[PDB]
């Protein structure tokens, strides 16, 4: 269908991939750093979801450079993807409002 709905879909699939890759890379970057908690996959995945949604619980976060880099990619992909949906919903509303104006 329309570009905005495809982009939304694409963004979602992409986000889910970043989430998974992010979980795997966080563990890899963090293991080896004393005091690190982002070291098992199940919670790292919870961490990536937390991060991508910016929910801010603060129960887990990276302590290494590479882990922080992985964090930036994840949050940014999350902010962007959700902003994309917002933009897609606006395109939907703007298009329907034009119709409701018989023009």
């Amino acid at each position, epitope marked *: 269908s329309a570009l905005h709905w495809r982009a939304a879909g694409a963004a979602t699939v992409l986000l889910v991939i970043v989430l998974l890759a992010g979980s*795997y890379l966080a563990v*890899l970057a963090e293991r080896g750093a*004393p005091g690190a*908690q982002l*070291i*098992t*996959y199940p919670r790292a995945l919870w961490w990536s979801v937390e991060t991508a949604t910016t929910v801010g619980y603060g129960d887990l976060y990276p302590v290494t450079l590479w882990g922080r880099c992985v964090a930036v990619v994840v949050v940014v992909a999350g902010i962007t993807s959700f902003g994309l949906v917002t933009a897609a919903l606006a395109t939907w509303f703007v298009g329907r409002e034009q119709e409701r104006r018989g023009h």
Partner: antibody
Amino acid sequence: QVQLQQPGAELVKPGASVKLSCKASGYTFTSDWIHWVKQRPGHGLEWIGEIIPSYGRANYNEKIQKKATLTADKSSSTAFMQLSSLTSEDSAVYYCARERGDGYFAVWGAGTTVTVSS
Amino acid sequence: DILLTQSPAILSVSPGERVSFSCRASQSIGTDIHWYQQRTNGSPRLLIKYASESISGIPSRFSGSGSGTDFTLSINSVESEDIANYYCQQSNRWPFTFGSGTKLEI
């Protein structure tokens, strides 16, 4: 069947250096980590280090003198541990274990009794 | 590093009694503790993961409890086959660490 296989023993002369092996079998995920644990007679379990085969990245217990080096042959599903310049202090049973990246060692090898002696 | 204290080091129980092994961490670690059993000259065997989750193939008389810094591994009605060393292990913070262990004695 036996998921981890280690040679029962290895004899090493002081200053020498042996390479222990750990052949794995059963379900193999990319997320698997192989750990190595040292147990001196009488004493308890001491974590040595870890390695993730699907990347070759390894980490070591930095609280103890570093005498190990880990590598892994993805082809033959085998983990290797290179111990170098051993002394009487390095004689003990070395276990290897498999961790599915979720924090616990589900399965351990039978362990290799390394004896450093002339 | 996270210190895992197992005290007392030796437990003397009578056949059939209920025994309780203790594991105290130096800092809070949720329920990220795991229990292993090691018999004379055998290798470690996972008995309980994440503080209280039973593992398949382990006698129902084995259980664990606790969270934070105090953990307990309990055995309802001990028996000769249970004679061994019991270690706790933590996966909350890097690196993983093991308690010093407690020997069960009947």
